[PDB]
Write a protein that binds this ligand. Structure first.
Ligand SMILES: Nc1ncnc2c1ncn2[C@@H]1O[C@H](COP(=O)(O)OP(=O)(O)O)[C@@H](O)[C@H]1O
Ligand SMILES: Nc1ncnc2c1ncn2[C@@H]1O[C@H](COP(=O)(O)OP(=O)(O)O)[C@@H](O)[C@H]1O
Lengths: 131, 50, 19, 374, 50, 374, 187
């Protein structure tokens, strides 16, 4: 009743505000870090959530960081081709033995904020850049 | 005819999206104000209980 | 007039899983 | 300043909470389930995902079987716990585990191998610099802000009551009861068959848990409430299933929480929670019972039903002598109180001396946790 | 091709209109709760000042 | 004379069996079907029958739609039940219902309005002087002849387990799986579509059920049996349809009842019947499990597949600790056991006090059954 | 349609005339939104009549038989079958699924096949499924204009995927394992 209302107020204010504040700052930092490396191909992202859905930009970012030749992106405009491209990127990440948990193609395609940010964080932390 | 109609449909969609964006921002501000006011109510209620 | 283990019906969306 | 905020991770049977040292509220809260697919996959071209953890497992609960790694405060499948911790560290908080110390919570009475196994996992798999294990009921007393009192904590797997006087705990008066929210959910699934509703699978268990969170309350008088419910249909509520069907529970609103006070409905010989609290108070010394009666503290998500405080106060006042006063201290944000206490424990200056270092673990094996933790 | 293009734009317009309507309803609810908060504020203030 | 014989009527989803108290065998056994004509009759003066009830509906399956008043142990249509009970009382037994007490059986867990509706129909319409309602698997223990054991009843509607120790029943250990014979009939139709034979109409469901009853068995080792059936054609049988067509059942004979042990074939995630029995045993106390292991009793028509006893014993022995005795008791007439023990319940002298009198029903209404039975 | 065209007097019995009847069904048939009102309207007036020209030059009139033939899709009892209609089949297939996923299946009903191209199947199907479904769930019937070839088009989508190059049945695999490999490889 009234105590439930107070608990709802406490969680909705504090937990949500702290969480999305941290996501906003980390999202800006990660967007700048990705845009630093993506200028070689002359590709630029304005929003981290929206631009990674089709999977082409993730493939290009892995192309820049790894320095190797990933397979062909699938020529398409549908949802299936986006799933295919994101799955190709995740398979290349599995090739380097980078350990991802709760990472699926449909999660990246659907635009989940937490999983995209976690994937970018795992790219920054665990993956190593070839020169 | 179709190329004539698509312009009007696109313009209506764009202006509907703008209205949605400003309504969402106003809703966010109203929710924050309501939460602050209810917390201010709780403080005085606890003081009266003591 | 050893128990049977639990079995799962197969998947077809991916070809094979080896290593 | 060279001070690094220590991650505080509260692990229960139901939900996992995680945040930083010194913050007011946890950054991440998510259910502790692991789901796996149970049907054929025919759309070749989509990605493959072996397991679902957390909120994503709840979102796609239709095509998955969900399993809780922690049962009755004891984790059974360690691989699922490792997956949950990995998701917490990398997808929820976005931090490197080797930078920060980690504080973990556990039930008071449990098998001794759990502490050693979590110590080994946190020191080897995650490479944390230091770790510590604390008891949740003490963290509730930290969150209350009072040095002395009795703490009753009931979660999703375990219920336990401890007394503490002036920061000194009495280990012989600590009581553990294996009655919690999962048994109440199972009982609600059982008694909903009488009205004609059948819930069988795990997604239905989640639905019944949501129904219990929405529409359950504790009656001040059980017989009076039963007579009132039999007299008229004023005490009825309606719930909407995800498929659009509407159910009406009615009498079952106050019968599910009553099993907390009378465990004979579940076939258990053990007494109720109020009886357990009174017995734990009576097991203490004579001249601290006066201070323990006036500082009863409730904690845990199971203690969130409406009317728990009044009913428990009335029952304890019935048991206790009439000459002195009994009050129940129930903060509105009690569900997270344990985690809050941990944050205070991670903020104190002396607690920097209480960490279990990696060198100490390397010297002493996994058995150092029994020596360095209560 | 133009038939499918017009179809897509029309569907997006309908979705935007639905979102605008539910945002307006949420704003109305927030304003009503904000009014109730200050009602409670003065009644608790009267009790405390007595 | 005095102490007139009280008739007992056992209603399940498949068949209805009625008979007197003193007899060891029921007088009437007939399927619970109500058929109605599809087509338009063209001969004037043939006579008009609106509905067909019982054996002649099975005789004239071509020109009728077969329907079942009971689905999953719950009475869906009550006018059809009135038709069934009237045909039982006046055509099969041809006795006056208002001068004998009536004993009835039902499933353990079911909607609570079903008992009230049975009581109201039995008193208001048939004007019976007394009636009683009992659990089927409890009566199976009466037919067994022992007061200690666990009963596993599998019928056309539901499957339920109940343990009874020393005449005391533990209500929290009762489990009710929804697998039954009709689901096996549907699965047999689905797997018979693989060989090219198609059965769609309701009349052909009876033919498929007869094929299941005549040419099915439970394999001791399922995967070995799959290898054996794939290697050669020695595991093949032939059946003749009523129009003279001959089909070959072949591999499917042990694939239909194997779904009882692995429900994932039907898309259900519930455990098998052996795991259900083991879980019902394990929910009981420590001291009474030894007597429950050595007195497992099989009951119901669905448990008459050949080789089900050896398979169940092997699975339970694999689940149970190695040092105990596990023996499965399977009467050769178990299809009627629910009836037979019920007749014994109507013969005891102390049972005369717990009939539900007409005066008690008048005073308390239809709810009195919840006070008087079980 | 042949059986009910015999009712007006026109006789079609050979295999060659069956194609003519099929062309008549493709050109002059539609699904009524309300069957009883459409029968009453067709009995009251002659506005629903249409004329067809036979290959020999004779002219026939369909009239009432335009909406009676597709109605057998929704009422199989016209044909002597006791099965349920397509709307009840779809609703029953929805009800067999889990409780949690029923809303998305309600919102994503897709029609396909050449039979689904009578004028008015989408509206009638939406009305019937809405009548069966609860009121809070909202029904959404999806029918692309080129649905008749959809079974082909997805196949052209399927063979062009990169993953599908590993999903074939190789000649070597068939040569090793006989013709029974198709059950393991294919769904
Ligand atoms: N508002 C509420 N009302 C009633 N019961 C609740 C409420 N919130 C949570 N619960 C119950 O409490 C349980 C969660 O307890 P929790 O505090 O997560 O335990 P732990 O953290 O030890 O796992 C849930 O299973 C639920 O049944
Ligand atoms: N000889 C048999 N072998 C195998 N199964 C049988 C046999 N006889 C009956 N059955 C199955 O048992 C079912 C009848 O069960 P029954 O004992 O009549 O249940 P109830 O009495 O509760 O209606 C039928 O549907 C049939 O599938």
């Amino acid at each position: 009743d009234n105590d439930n209302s107070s608990a709802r107020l406490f969680e909705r204010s504090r937990i949500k505000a702290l969480a999305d504040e941290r996501e906003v700052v980390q999202k800006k930092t990660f967007t700048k870090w990705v845009n630093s490396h993506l200028a070689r191909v002359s590709c630029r992202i304005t929003d981290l959530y929206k631009d990674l859905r089709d999977g082409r930009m993730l493939i290009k970012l892995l192309e820049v960081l790894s320095g190797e030749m990933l397979p062909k992106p699938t020529k398409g405009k549908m949802r299936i081709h986006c799933l295919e491209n994101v799955d190709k990127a995740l398979q290349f990440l599995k090739e380097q033995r980078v350990h991802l948990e709760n990472m699926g193609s449909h999660d990246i395609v659907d635009g989940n904020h937490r999983l995209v940010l976690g994937l970018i964080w795992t790219i920054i932390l665990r993956f190593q850049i070839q020169d | 005819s179709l190329n004539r109609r698509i312009q009007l449909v696109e313009e209506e969609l764009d202006r509907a999206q703008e209205r949605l964006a400003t309504a969402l921002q106003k809703l966010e501000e109203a929710e924050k104000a309501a939460d602050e006011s209810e917390r201010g109510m709780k403080v005085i209620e606890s003081r009266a209980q003591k | 007039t050893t128990g049977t283990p639990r079995t799962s019906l197969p998947h077809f969306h991916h070809p094979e899983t080896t290593r | 300043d060279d001070d690094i905020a220590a991650l505080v991770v509260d692990n229960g049977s139901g939900m996992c909470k995680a945040g930083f040292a010194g913050d007011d509220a946890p950054r991440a809260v998510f259910p502790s389930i692991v789901g796996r697919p149970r049907h054929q996959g025919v759309m070749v071209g989509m990605g493959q995902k072996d397991s679902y953890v957390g909120d994503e497992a709840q979102s796609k609960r239709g095509i998955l079987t969900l399993k809780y790694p922690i049962e009755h405060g004891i984790v059974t499948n360690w691989d699922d716990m490792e997956k949950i911790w990995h998701h917490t560290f990398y997808n929820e908080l976005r931090v490197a585990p080797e930078e920060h110390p980690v504080l973990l919570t556990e039930a008071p009475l449990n098998p001794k191998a759990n502490r050693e196994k979590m110590t080994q996992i946190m020191f080897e798999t995650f490479n944390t610099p230091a770790m510590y294990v604390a008891i949740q009921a003490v963290l509730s007393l930290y969150a209350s802000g009072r040095t002395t009192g009795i703490v009753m904590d009931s979660g999703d797997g375990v219920t336990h009551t401890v007394p503490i006087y002036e920061g000194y705990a009495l280990p012989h008066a600590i009581l553990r009861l294996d009655l919690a929210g999962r048994d109440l959910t199972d009982y609600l699934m059982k008694i909903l068959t009488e009205r004609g509703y059948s819930f069988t699978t795990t997604a239905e268990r989640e639905i019944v848990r949501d129904i219990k969170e929405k529409l359950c309350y504790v009656a001040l008088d059980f017989e009076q409430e039963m007579a009132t419910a039999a007299s008229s249909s004023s005490l009825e509520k309606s719930y909407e299933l995800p498929d659009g069907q509407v159910i009406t529970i009615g009498n079952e609103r106050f019968r599910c929480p009553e099993a907390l006070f009378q465990p004979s409905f579940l076939g258990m010989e053990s007494c109720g929670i109020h009886e357990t609290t009174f017995n734990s108070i009576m097991k203490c010394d004579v001249d601290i019972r006066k201070d323990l009666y006036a500082n009863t503290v409730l904690s845990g998500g199971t203690t969130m039903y409406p009317g728990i405080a009044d009913r428990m106060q009335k029952e304890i006042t019935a048991l206790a002598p009439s000459t002195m006063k009994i009050k129940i201290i129930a903060p509105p944000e009690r569900k997270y109180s344990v985690w809050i206490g941990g944050s205070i424990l991670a903020s104190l200056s002396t607690f920097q001396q209480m960490w279990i270092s990696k060198q100490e673990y390397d010297e002493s094996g996994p058995s150092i946790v029994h020596r360095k933790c209560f | 091709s133009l038939n499918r293009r017009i179809q897509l734009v029309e569907e997006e317009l309908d979705r935007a209109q639905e979102r605008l309507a539910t945002a307006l309803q949420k704003l109305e609810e927030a304003e009503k709760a904000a009014d109730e908060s200050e009602r409670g504020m003065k009644v608790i203030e009267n009790r405390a000042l007595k």
